[PDB]
RNA sequence: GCUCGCCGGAAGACCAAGGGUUCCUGUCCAACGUUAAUCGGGGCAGGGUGAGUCGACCCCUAAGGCGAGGCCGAAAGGCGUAGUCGAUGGGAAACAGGUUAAUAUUCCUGUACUUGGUGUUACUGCGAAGGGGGGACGGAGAAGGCUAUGUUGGCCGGGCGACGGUUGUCCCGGUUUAAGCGUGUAGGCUGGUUUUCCAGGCAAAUCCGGAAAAUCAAGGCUGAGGCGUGAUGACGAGGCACUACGGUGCUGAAGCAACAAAUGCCCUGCUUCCAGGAAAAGCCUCUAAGCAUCAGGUAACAUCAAAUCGUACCCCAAACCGACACAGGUGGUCAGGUAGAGAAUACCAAGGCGCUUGAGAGAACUCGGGUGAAGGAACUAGGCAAAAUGGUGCCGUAACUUCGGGAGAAGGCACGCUGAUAUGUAGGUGAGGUCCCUCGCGGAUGGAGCUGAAAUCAGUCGAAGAUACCAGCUGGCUGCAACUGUUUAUUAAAAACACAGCACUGUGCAAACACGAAAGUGGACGUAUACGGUGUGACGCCUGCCCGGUGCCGGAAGGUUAAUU
RNA sequence: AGGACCGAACCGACUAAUGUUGAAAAAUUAGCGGAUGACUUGUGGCUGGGGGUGAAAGGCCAAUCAAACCGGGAGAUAGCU
């Protein structure tokens, strides 16, 4: 069976990468929440 | 050209291994550890100046550090750059 | 000509094709082509705004001269061509100064024919004149609605309008729908009918032939569930309601025109 | 190590994605490995990835994204112009041999090629954010010419056989060589050249487009393969020497021809059809402003540069997606022999494996198979399952029919091997020779050699010759749906949905309608032979009566009637 | 020529048996349908939750769908256990 996760680095970065989060107000609030919680890996880029 | 301070900083160490010794003894090639950001031209100039040999060509590669386990704690060694320096067939460093 | 195919397979039994032997067989004239990619009926929000559109063959847009404002310079028809973008055929014409253009092909036009536009053009098919220079009762096509804008009425295959009356600054036209309309007498028109009148005799014959033209299937409202359409629902085949569109507007007879700007130009509705 | 078995259009070899040290060497066996483990994709330590030409990066764009000003919106924001990003597409250049425990088109040997900079020389009208050309494009089909590749013969080296025979029409192995450079062939396209003129190409143009003369009738462009060189080289069966017995060192024969032949190449071709088949740059050319004995352009020579990042390993898999060392899923390329129509199938080659618990025993019962007396659907909800049919050639084939079908209807006959026709035929291929010419990769003739069906006649073996694998059960009556399609991912594949066709109805273009507080956008760069909605559902014969109810369309005299006053 | 025919790859999923704490949270084996098209497939892109998309099954929208998922209102309310 084909499963749901079909990896692709390019699509991963374009969908959830740092520059994608930084391009909208809601993405920047995601980043702010993750910084406030203290996440070591802030997005999927790293 | 490249200033002397840069040249004094680019070369890090000579690389010692069986492949390096074979390279020296068969094809007149030195194997060096160099700075990550050193280009081929900088390495060439630095070997010309500091070791006083005329070089033919430089080949470079980047070695990726190994992921290691230091007692249940995960770590990683650093990437470094390796240069294959072909001397001009009469130099004998 | 109109040709019926032989029933060698169930998909060919009912096909009727219209074939014109004199259409050009080679490639179109390259300097007058452009791309037009498809939309799938989606707008800039990405939503489907017109249903049943998608797929079909790739097409290249031909730049057709609907304005015909190159006055005084005669042109010669070089060849007739197939145009995927419209139902009429187009003609490649060559002006004496050496410029080439595409025009809608009027009925009876063939290679080697002379055409020209302007106030002094002769009254013969393919010539474009301002409608104040065209005799009353003439049959014209590619009619302008505002002077200099380009032809907008009677452009598909076989259609034409008739100039019924002229009263000062306006002419009254009879449109294919039967509507009577007034346009400024300075709007241009082209003499004759749009060619390819056999276009309506073609029979597609199979579903795939409609899919080749970018038409996607239509699902009947009665076949859905009540959440999807006002007609949906029922144990078995049930209707019991007045026919409506998917958005709830009565769909058999209810009139939808509401444009008070242009009401002054409608002499009589189409009935 | 010797046998045995399995895959071989993969269970072999590569590439992309994804993973990230799993790669190689030394060492260890606690935990991990469905058992043991001296082994491991496990632990620990060390080593390993070399590029001007491969890829990225780079130049160019598609869908789409972002978007200075702008338009719009309580705010947040939405859309969009100039622009700028975005490959899955376009754009310069390298091959063979050798080598490591582990990399190699990257290292070494040999032989090449591309772009740009700088300098010198010689000649010289150069110049774009503009114009033109080009790049540049579909489906199907048919050949013809080729090659990869294979087979056989010749040649070279070796052999003379564990058991009857084997100096021969015998056995085994080899018989390989690239890019580049020169030649411009099979073949495809296109008339060429000169002059004059012009409402066109936002201005100009010597370019393109158009018009008119003269003249010549052969010029140009593209192009697989072959041949020559590259190469007196490399490689090469094998042999001879070290072995510290893993492999190292030295030497080295022949290296040809014929035939068969792709789904690869010529071919982005040709023929044909309708559903009518990207963009932009690189590239070539034209000028504008401008520069004007400069700059710049063209050519030759010399020299310099080509940075950075990736490169190990897995990659139908134990390393990726499935929690697992999981009978699942995963895009592209390569494609040997015998039989065969074949990439099916059977047995094999190259290569790779025996699937990480075994040893016995030989009960019921379960699972997967083989055979079965007589009967032959009696079983059962139901012939479910099983059995059966199954190939090629020829003969023959009903109702009905929309004239195509039905139809492979049904049914039947032949089929192995050997000899002859014919010491190998019809056919295909084609050397030498001979004769011509605008002499060449030429033309005509010529037939050596090679290859080679199908048939007929005669004989012959078995129970059986389409002998295995592979490979339709057939016929009759009837409901439904015209048909090919689609659907409840994971209990429903259907008579349900769709469909071509039919009808009604809306819509005159700033269209109706839809998404949107709006700006806008789709409809459509379409224009009533068009577009939207609704119902019906090929085709044939048809489609009767009712406008009282509900709806819609039209009317506007009267009654009633809002804000307002 | 053909939404032509037979048939592998490929795409499906009609029947039966097995399996049902499975080898597998939908498969295996033997047959089966399409197989030049309304075909199939890679890469990238767009449509967002009363919304999308739907050859229409209330199907699908990350093993979730007659209204996804995550966080918040939130210790909702529970004459019920
Ligand atoms: Mg080098
Ligand atoms: Mg490198
Ligand atoms: Mg529609
Ligand atoms: Mg319809
Ligand atoms: Mg239903
Ligand atoms: Mg409703
Ligand atoms: Mg009923
Ligand atoms: Mg009723
Ligand atoms: Mg490790
Ligand atoms: Mg290993
Ligand atoms: Mg032990
Ligand atoms: Mg153990
Ligand atoms: Mg290990
Ligand atoms: Mg764009
Ligand atoms: Mg925008
Ligand atoms: Mg702004
Ligand atoms: Mg760009
Ligand atoms: Mg690309
Ligand atoms: Mg390797
Ligand atoms: Mg050959
Ligand atoms: Mg590798
Ligand atoms: Mg295992
Ligand atoms: Mg597996
Ligand atoms: Mg697949
Ligand atoms: Mg097979
Ligand atoms: Mg037993
Ligand atoms: Mg049994
Ligand atoms: Mg049996
Ligand atoms: Mg027996
Ligand atoms: Mg029996
Ligand atoms: Mg019996
Ligand atoms: Mg019987
Ligand atoms: Mg019975
Ligand atoms: Mg009974
Ligand atoms: Mg059965
Ligand atoms: Mg059977
Ligand atoms: Mg009945
Ligand atoms: Mg049906
Ligand atoms: Mg189901
Ligand atoms: Mg509009
Ligand atoms: Mg119906
Ligand atoms: Mg009736
Ligand atoms: Mg078919
Ligand atoms: Mg399905
Ligand atoms: Mg089912
Ligand atoms: Mg199966
Ligand atoms: Mg069929
Ligand atoms: Mg088939
Ligand atoms: Mg229902
Ligand atoms: Mg789901
Ligand atoms: Mg709700
Ligand atoms: Mg509360
Ligand atoms: Mg509670």
Curated annotation (Swiss-Prot), chain A:
<dbReference type="GO" id="GO:0003735">
    <property type="term" value="F:structural constituent of ribosome"/>
</dbReference>
<dbReference type="InterPro" id="IPR020939">
    <property type="entry name" value="Ribosomal_bL34_CS"/>
</dbReference>
<dbReference type="GO" id="GO:0002181">
    <property type="term" value="P:cytoplasmic translation"/>
</dbReference>
<dbReference type="Pfam" id="PF00468">
    <property type="entry name" value="Ribosomal_L34"/>
</dbReference>
<comment type="subunit">
    <text>Part of the 50S ribosomal subunit.</text>
</comment>
<comment type="similarity">
    <text>Belongs to the bacterial ribosomal protein bL34 family.</text>
</comment>
<dbReference type="GO" id="GO:0022625">
    <property type="term" value="C:cytosolic large ribosomal subunit"/>
</dbReference>
<keyword id="KW-0687">Ribonucleoprotein</keyword>
<keyword id="KW-0689">Ribosomal protein</keyword>
<protein>
    <recommendedName>
        <fullName>Large ribosomal subunit protein bL34</fullName>
    </recommendedName>
</protein>
<dbReference type="GO" id="GO:0005737">
    <property type="term" value="C:cytoplasm"/>
</dbReference>
<dbReference type="InterPro" id="IPR000271">
    <property type="entry name" value="Ribosomal_bL34"/>
</dbReference>
Swiss-Prot record, chain B:
<dbReference type="InterPro" id="IPR012678">
    <property type="entry name" value="Ribosomal_uL23/eL15/eS24_sf"/>
</dbReference>
<protein>
    <recommendedName>
        <fullName>Large ribosomal subunit protein uL23</fullName>
    </recommendedName>
</protein>
<keyword id="KW-0689">Ribosomal protein</keyword>
<comment type="similarity">
    <text>Belongs to the universal ribosomal protein uL23 family.</text>
</comment>
<comment type="function">
    <text>One of the early assembly proteins, it binds 23S rRNA; is essential for growth. One of the proteins that surround the polypeptide exit tunnel on the outside of the subunit. Acts as the docking site for trigger factor for Ffh binding to the ribosome (SRP54) and to nascent polypeptide chains.</text>
</comment>
<dbReference type="Pfam" id="PF00276">
    <property type="entry name" value="Ribosomal_L23"/>
</dbReference>
<dbReference type="InterPro" id="IPR012677">
    <property type="entry name" value="Nucleotide-bd_a/b_plait_sf"/>
</dbReference>
<dbReference type="GO" id="GO:0000027">
    <property type="term" value="P:ribosomal large subunit assembly"/>
</dbReference>
<dbReference type="GO" id="GO:0019843">
    <property type="term" value="F:rRNA binding"/>
</dbReference>
<dbReference type="GO" id="GO:0005737">
    <property type="term" value="C:cytoplasm"/>
</dbReference>
<dbReference type="GO" id="GO:0022625">
    <property type="term" value="C:cytosolic large ribosomal subunit"/>
</dbReference>
<dbReference type="InterPro" id="IPR001014">
    <property type="entry name" value="Ribosomal_uL23_CS"/>
</dbReference>
<dbReference type="InterPro" id="IPR013025">
    <property type="entry name" value="Ribosomal_uL23-like"/>
</dbReference>
<dbReference type="GO" id="GO:0003735">
    <property type="term" value="F:structural constituent of ribosome"/>
</dbReference>
<keyword id="KW-0687">Ribonucleoprotein</keyword>
Curated annotation (Swiss-Prot), chain C:
<dbReference type="GO" id="GO:0022625">
    <property type="term" value="C:cytosolic large ribosomal subunit"/>
</dbReference>
<dbReference type="InterPro" id="IPR005880">
    <property type="entry name" value="Ribosomal_uL2_bac/org-type"/>
</dbReference>
<keyword id="KW-0687">Ribonucleoprotein</keyword>
<dbReference type="GO" id="GO:0003735">
    <property type="term" value="F:structural constituent of ribosome"/>
</dbReference>
<dbReference type="GO" id="GO:0016740">
    <property type="term" value="F:transferase activity"/>
</dbReference>
<dbReference type="GO" id="GO:0008270">
    <property type="term" value="F:zinc ion binding"/>
</dbReference>
<dbReference type="InterPro" id="IPR002171">
    <property type="entry name" value="Ribosomal_uL2"/>
</dbReference>
<dbReference type="GO" id="GO:0003723">
    <property type="term" value="F:RNA binding"/>
</dbReference>
<dbReference type="InterPro" id="IPR022666">
    <property type="entry name" value="Ribosomal_uL2_RNA-bd_dom"/>
</dbReference>
<protein>
    <recommendedName>
        <fullName>Large ribosomal subunit protein uL2</fullName>
    </recommendedName>
</protein>
<dbReference type="Pfam" id="PF03947">
    <property type="entry name" value="Ribosomal_L2_C"/>
</dbReference>
<comment type="function">
    <text>One of the primary rRNA binding proteins. Located near the base of the L1 stalk, it is probably also mobile. Required for association of the 30S and 50S subunits to form the 70S ribosome, for tRNA binding and peptide bond formation. It has been suggested to have peptidyltransferase activity; this is highly controversial.</text>
</comment>
<dbReference type="GO" id="GO:0005737">
    <property type="term" value="C:cytoplasm"/>
</dbReference>
<dbReference type="InterPro" id="IPR022669">
    <property type="entry name" value="Ribosomal_uL2_C"/>
</dbReference>
<feature type="region of interest" description="Disordered">
    <location>
        <begin position="27"/>
        <end position="52"/>
    </location>
</feature>
């Amino acid at each position: 069976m084909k499963r749901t996760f079909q990896p692709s680095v390019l699509k991963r970065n374009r969908s959830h990468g740092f520059r994608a989060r930084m391009a909208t107000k809601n993405g920047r609030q995601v980043l702010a929440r993750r910084r406030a919680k203290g996440r070591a890996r802030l997005t999927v880029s790293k | 050209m490249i200033r002397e301070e840069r040249l004094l900083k680019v070369l890090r160490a000579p690389h010692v291994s069986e492949k390096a010794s074979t390279a020296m003894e068969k094809s007149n090639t030195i194997v060096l550890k160099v700075a990550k950001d050193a280009t081929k031209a900088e390495i060439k100039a630095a070997v010309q100046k500091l070791f006083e040999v005329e070089v033919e060509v430089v080949n470079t590669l980047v070695v990726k550090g190994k992921v290691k386990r230091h007692g249940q704690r995960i770590g990683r060694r650093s990437d470094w750059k390796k240069a294959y320096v072909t001397l001009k067939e009469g130099q004998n460093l | 000509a109109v040709v019926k195919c032989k029933p060698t397979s169930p998909g060919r039994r009912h096909v009727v094709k219209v074939v014109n032997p004199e259409l050009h067989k080679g490639k179109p004239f390259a300097p007058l082509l452009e791309k037009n990619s498809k939309s799938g009926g989606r707008n800039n929000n990405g939503r489907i705004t017109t249903r049943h559109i998608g797929g079909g063959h790739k097409q290249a847009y031909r730049i057709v001269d609907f304005k015909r404002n190159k006055d005084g310079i005669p042109a010669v028809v070089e060849r007739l061509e197939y145009d995927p973008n419209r139902s009429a055929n187009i003609a490649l014409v060559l002006y004496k100064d050496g410029e080439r253009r595409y025009i809608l092909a009027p009925k009876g036009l063939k290679a080697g024919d002379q055409i020209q536009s302007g106030v002094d053009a002769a009254i013969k098919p393919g010539n474009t004149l301002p409608m104040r220079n065209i005799p009353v009762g003439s049959t014209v096509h590619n009619v302008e609605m505002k002077p200099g804008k380009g032809g907008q009425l009677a452009r598909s295959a076989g259609t034409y309008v008739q100039i019924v009356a002229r009263d000062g600054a306006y002419v009254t036209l009879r449109l294919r729908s039967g509507e009577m309309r007034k346009v400024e007498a300075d709007c241009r028109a082209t003499l004759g009918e749009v060619g390819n009148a056999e276009h309506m005799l073609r029979v597609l014959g199979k579903a795939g032939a409609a899919r080749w033209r970018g038409v996607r299937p239509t699902v009947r409202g009665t076949a859905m569930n009540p959440v999807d359409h006002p007609h949906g629902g029922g144990e078995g085949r049930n209707f019991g309601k007045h026919p409506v569109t998917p958005w709830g507007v009565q769909t058999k007879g209810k009139k939808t025109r509401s444009n008070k700007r242009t009401d002054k130009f409608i002499v009589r509705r189409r009935s």
